[PDB]
RNA sequence: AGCUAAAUAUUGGCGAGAGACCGAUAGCGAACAAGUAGAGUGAUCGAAAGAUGAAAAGAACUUUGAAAAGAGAGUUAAAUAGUACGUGAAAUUGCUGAAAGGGAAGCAUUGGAAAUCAGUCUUACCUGGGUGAGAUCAGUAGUCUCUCGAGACUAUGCA
RNA sequence: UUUCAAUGGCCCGUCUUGAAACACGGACCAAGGAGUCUAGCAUCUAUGCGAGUGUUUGGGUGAUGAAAACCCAUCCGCGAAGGUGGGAACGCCCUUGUGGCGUGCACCAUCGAAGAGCAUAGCUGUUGGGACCCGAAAGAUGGUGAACCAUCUAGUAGCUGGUUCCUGCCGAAGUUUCCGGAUAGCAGAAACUCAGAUCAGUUUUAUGUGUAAAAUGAGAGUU
RNA sequence: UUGAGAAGCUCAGACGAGUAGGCAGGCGUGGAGGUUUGUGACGAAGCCUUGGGCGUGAGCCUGGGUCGAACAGCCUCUAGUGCAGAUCUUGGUGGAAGUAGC
RNA sequence: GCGAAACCACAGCCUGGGGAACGGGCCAGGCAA
RNA sequence: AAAACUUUCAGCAACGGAUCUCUUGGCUCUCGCAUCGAUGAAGAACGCAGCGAAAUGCGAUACGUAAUGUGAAUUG
């Protein structure tokens, strides 16, 4: 599987011989942000595994790529705030206004 | 109509998943038969004792050689007979008097999944059943 | 594949608008000598089969996509790769606060949030 | 069935030791959801109390007599064979060293160093329970007591008007074989359980009638697994003349059992996974010239109209035929 | 002719622990003044009735009214909690606004009209250069956990 | 959403009746409200074991509810007391295919004379038990001042009224025949054997309207 | 070509009345063991509302208003589990009616 | 001024025909303010 | 045709007390124990508080005294 961990996309790997530990069951690997090279190391680790496999990995990382480009471009927008609302403090200033 | 099995042993299903596709996959009417009896009811699965076993295989003109009887159901053994033969057999379960009495005195037993890797056609195979009547 | 129905209006039950103690919610009228249930001229339709909708549709709101309910700020994570399919429902229970957080990582993931704007308040 | 022979013991600081068990034979036993269920579903009615109402005291009327008065002789305890118990408890002994069920079932171990976890014999004598949570914390097993605390809501509904006040997960088994302080060490830590070796409890393996409890065995426990249970050929020496169960098949991985070449190497040929639609549409071989190429390979050369006239036409008829035409 | 422990019973009495039990038309007839009021010469029969709020802070005071009460005003997080007190449904009734209204109404289809909501989005992508950068990059230097290299970092330069 | 315009639509449930006609029950709203609990039997299916089978009378035991779990001694219950052909499956082929040669399960024909249960759970059925719910004067015992009260009592019913959510598939019979019934038939549900085999609210051909042997169709027959 | 919830995906054709009755899959309520490292004073449950949706349907999800302390999705266990009727029980409330009348 | 009970599916122009009453609803009609 | 009256729908106020939440109550099962009276019991009546409406408590030593404790509250 591929996973971003802290804006940085790495691929998880398990095998059946490390299935027993699971401590050390999960193999991780770092994928570079050049994305023609994320995909050269994709094969070269995935490599003879079933292309069912493979493809479900590059799709990923694809989605886990536009993901963090979109978290990139809100940060850059000044965009707006959401203060939320109380039904407690609605409801009093309600009454205290119609009181006034 | 029968076309998914009743049971919930979730080893007859994982059973039946070989046979679906060795029926489908092969033109042999052995696995068609075999995935067909792996749906029956337990009742229309009767014991099969090993002494009518020993008598199928060694019948008339003998010649046992070393074909491989297979049933679909359980294989009961038969205190009333001493000398078991030597005998190669398949079948769903053993009891565990009988399966020690066919390893301690010649072949061996098997269960369905080492037959279909050894004669996934049928190859040279007995199929055998129990008395329905009971 | 577009999101088209085979009908709009609801199935309301028979003598239902007549009535208060009977409910609008449909029931089959099993009366022997019932001649709305016998599909006669100027009744009402009845529930069958041969109303639903497209398999490929069903469940699909008229903008094409599929409600799918997110209780918290985790559920709205796994519609990451189904996007263009489903859409983040914010459950009705989910408070204030934690429904700004299902917006603003839904707004980043690219998912759709039908429920955006509830509970919630806008300040620039 | 060929997995993983031996198993390696952890000491109290968190450190494997050179030593190793052996994986018992009932470690391999088959694991069965469904069996297991109707065993729990049973076993979980046995510790039930009776309900009624007065017996003295229509249905329909105010301050009347409901229907059917709650009668205490109900059906409350439910019989199982104790075959069936022990195939339900050893299938759920089995299912418990493989991690995947663990998970599976909600237990945090993504960081538990092996499965089945097994530690020495010194975790016996523990007597506080500072010191098992320093053991849990080394051993990474903690990340399960720390769900179970965060998971204590208040019960649902008019239980909690019932003694049934609180709710969480279930944490850990430590599976001990003496007591000497172990069971008052770990009792106070959310969740975890602590059960003999010898009195395996379905409801503490299989809990919910869900397999895959995450068990903690002791070295001293885990050898007797090879004692309790027994094995397909042998028999358990504390259970009289019991065996473990034989299964439907030796391999139960189909997808190899298929794949494999014995079976590969005679099936016949294979057909497309999904096959194309062969005609989609109905297209009128009149109407579209196209379709017509298609049925007949005659239309290209047809020349429907020929002149068979204009040679001096032998108009034929016959005298006394005109003559009884005209007539009358 | 006679006695005799323990093993056994237990809708009562003295206490105790629980429950896949009922949750105020239920569970006891009784969650409370419950065999209580009340009914019957009598024997007997026999109910209805739980919840303001964290705290009473239970509404001073002014005013109108014979009072009862009302209006100001106060307390409170809230009086859409004011002792007719938790939430306050339906039936049902009054006021207002709307349209409609030749012995019914009623609903169903198709619209129209009035009234009202559904939801809006060019914006991003790609390419070009410059400018400063950073690092998963150094013809680079160290530590940590793993299994040479795979991670997390700490310097240092930005090719 | 309200309203209007055009087209429409006899009050619902029960019971009755082919059908209605009906006669009933319905002022309105909320809440309550009726195949349940249990022992026995048989069936189907699922599971464990299998010539066996069943720990829970009881004993051992259970430090973290200990009425759970776990373990087994002596009984006991229920079981246990040969050829011929057609045949499932397989092999050998070999003019291959076609078929033959075989080996022949279950079983059926024939001639004849190599045990399959036990236990648990479910489903449907049936018999009892207050027995789906409601409704018939009671009667008896014992009391109170012919009357009245309390219990036995969940006394009695072929009858009356009612019996509660959705969709999908199949879907009769509505009556022969003997005689309140056993049959049958229709519908299913299972198990079988065959389409190279039989059939048909069929039609012809022809022999003497019946019978027997061509077309038109459909796979047909059993338990 | 990625289309192995093999209980999946895919392809083709015909078909669709229904009482008694037979079969199957589901929806909903209270509580029970497991689970969602679930929701909740930044508002649970409930309630109303010509707000928006989902399902053939039983039903479901959500917005607004009230509201104030609990609750739910999923897999199984379980039962005092689903109402329009019973001249049904209980409570409430109308027309009749400001009528009979006093 | 003090104030019920009974009753209540819902209503209420007929004309005819509407086969089974049909008029209290259906169709032709008039009426319908 | 507007008003009046009649009708539907919405707003608002009454009316009603369902729903939801709980709960010093009920029911059910298990467990331990052995204890009334002529030395006046059970029951009943009349009394009694700095004031009690029921309600408990108490007996002219009356909402109790002695004694052993606790150690500063009763509470409208």
């Given at each position: ?100 | ?134 | ?124 | ?93 089995a299912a418990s060293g493989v991690p995947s069920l663990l998970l599976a079932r909600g237990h945090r171990i993504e960081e538990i160093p092996e499965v089945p976890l097994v530690v020495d014999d010194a975790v016996q004598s523990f007597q506080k329970t ?199």
């Open positions: 599987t591929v996973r971003e961990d802290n804006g940085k996309l790495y691929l998880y790997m398990k095998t059946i011989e490390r299935a027993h530990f699971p401590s050390k069951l999960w193999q991780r690997i770092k994928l570079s942000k050049n994305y023609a090279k994320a995909l050269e190391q994709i094969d070269q680790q995935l490599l003879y595994w079933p292309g069912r496999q493979i493809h479900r990995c590059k799709q990923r990382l694809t989605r886990l790529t536009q993901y963090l480009l979109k978290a990139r471009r809100l940060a850059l927008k000044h965009q707006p705030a959401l203060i939320p609302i109380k039904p407690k403090q609605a409801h009093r200033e309600a009454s205290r206004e119609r009181k006034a | 109509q029968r076309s998914k099995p009743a049971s919930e042993n979730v080893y007859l299903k994982l059973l039946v998943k070989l046979y679906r596709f060795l029926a489908r996959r092969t033109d042999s009417r052995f696995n068609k038969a075999i995935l067909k009896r792996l749906f029956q009811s337990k009742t229309n699965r009767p014991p099969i004792s090993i002494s009518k076993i020993a008598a199928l295989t060694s019948r008339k003109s003998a010649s046992s050689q070393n074909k491989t009887t297979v049933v679909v159901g359980t294989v009961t053994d038969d205190e009333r007979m001493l000398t078991v033969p030597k005998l190669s057999i398949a079948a769903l379960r053993f009891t565990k008097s009988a399966r020690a009495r066919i390893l301690k005195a010649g072949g061996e037993v098997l269960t369905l999944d080492q037959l279909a890797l050894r004669a996934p056609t049928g190859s040279n195979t007995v199929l055998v059943r129990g008395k329905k009547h009971a | 594949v577009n999101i088209i129905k085979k009908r709009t209006k609801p199935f309301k039950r028979h003598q239902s608008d007549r009535f208060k103690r009977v409910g609008e919610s449909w029931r089959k009228p099993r009366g022997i000598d019932s001649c709305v249930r016998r599909r006669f001229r100027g009744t009402i339709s009845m529930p069958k089969i041969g109303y639903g909708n497209n398999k490929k549709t069903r469940y699909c709101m008229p903008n094409g996509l599929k409600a799918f309910l997110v209780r918290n700020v985790s559920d709205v994570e796994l519609l990451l790769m189904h996007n263009k399919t489903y859409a983040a429902e914010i459950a009705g229970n989910v408070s204030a606060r934690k429904r700004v957080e299902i917006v603003e990582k839904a707004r980043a993931l690219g998912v759709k949030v039908t429920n955006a704007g509830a509970k919630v308040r806008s300040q620039e | 069935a060929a997995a993983r022979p031996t198993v390696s013991i952890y000491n109290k600081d968190g450190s494997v030791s050179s030593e190793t068990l052996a994986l018992p034979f009932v470690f391999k036993a088959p694991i069965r959801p469904d069996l297991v269920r109707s065993v729990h579903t049973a076993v979980a009615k046995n510790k039930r109390q009776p309900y009624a109402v007065s017996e003295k005291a229509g249905n329909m009327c105010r301050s009347g007599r409901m229907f059917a008065p709650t009668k205490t002789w109900r059906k409350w305890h439910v019989k199982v064979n104790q075959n069936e118990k022990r195939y339900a408890i050893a299938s759920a002994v500072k010191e098992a949570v320093a053991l849990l914390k080394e051993i990474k097993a903690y990340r399960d007591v720390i769900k179970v605390a965060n998971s204590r809501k208040l019960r649902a509904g008019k239980g909690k008007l019932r003694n049934r006040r609180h709710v969480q997960r279930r944490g850990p088994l430590v599976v001990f074989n003496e007591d000497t302080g172990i069971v008052k060490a770990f009792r106070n830590i959310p969740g975890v359980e602590i059960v003999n070796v010898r009195r395996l409890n379905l409801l503490q393996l299989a809990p919910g009638g869900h397999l895959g409890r995450f068990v903690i065995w002791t070295k001293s426990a885990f050898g007797l697994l090879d004692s309790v249970f027994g094995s397909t050929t042998e028999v358990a020496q504390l259970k009289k003349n019991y065996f473990l169960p034989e299964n439907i098949i030796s391999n139960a991985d189909v997808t190899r059992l298929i794949n494999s070449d014995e079976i590969q190497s005679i099936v016949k040929a294979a057909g497309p996974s999904r096959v194309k639609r062969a005609h989609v549409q109905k297209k009128n071989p009149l109407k579209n010239k196209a379709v017509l190429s298609r049925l007949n390979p005659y239309a290209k050369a047809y020349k429907a109209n020929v002149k068979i006239n204009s040679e001096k036409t032998p108009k034929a008829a016959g005298e006394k035929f005109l003559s009884v035409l005209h007539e009358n």
